[PDB]
């Protein structure tokens, strides 16, 4: 599960 501040916007990889 790839994490970064832009991926976080999809509210899944949190």
């Amino acid at each position, epitope marked *: 599960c790839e994490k*970064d*501040q*832009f991926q*976080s*916007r*999809n509210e899944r990889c949190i």
Partner: antibody
Amino acid sequence: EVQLVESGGDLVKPGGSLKLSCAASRFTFSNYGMSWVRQTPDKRLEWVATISSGGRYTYYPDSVKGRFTISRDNAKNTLYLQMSSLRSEDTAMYYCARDYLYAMDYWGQGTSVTVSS
Amino acid sequence: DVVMTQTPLSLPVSLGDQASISCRSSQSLVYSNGNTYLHWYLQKPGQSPKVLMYKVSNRFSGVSDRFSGSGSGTDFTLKISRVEAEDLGVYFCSQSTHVPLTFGAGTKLELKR
């Protein structure tokens, strides 16, 4: 007590190349996206690059896309920024930062880069 | 790119008093999922920035509850309820709704004496 320590800044001639490094400590580096942000002599901030936790994705603004390359070594807990085709407007203090949830929570104390003939 | 305009750019305030900073974006910061990715940072003198707030109103762990964030769309506010000497610095708003991530120019909090 997260810690980030940048190194590698220097004077570089226009058209030259330079590699910055950022040593991460006291957190599980592999679980977080990481970013570079620069602060120019006029004190403005400009986001430079981001890389996802596992290195699958990278992101850049047009001002550096193609010329700058972000990478990470999750075994060595280190972040890198390879800079090439350097321009005078790239002169700035460069900060490494940890992506935590939706923003960049902790930032290193920075390393200075000057591009001049 | 999204332009972030902060008001005021210089903010003199007395200790223990209230202060408020405005941040206006050149386009809406509402993301396709209806969330708003507007964040605030503080750069203390001689230091690098540190984050204060994320997604308009959420305090990061370790940030005093004297700080509050509010707003919607293009109009956002950071409020400090009782100013302390350690609040001295430059406050930056930032958006990540639209790539590239952008920052406002900074608002310098100054202590009156």
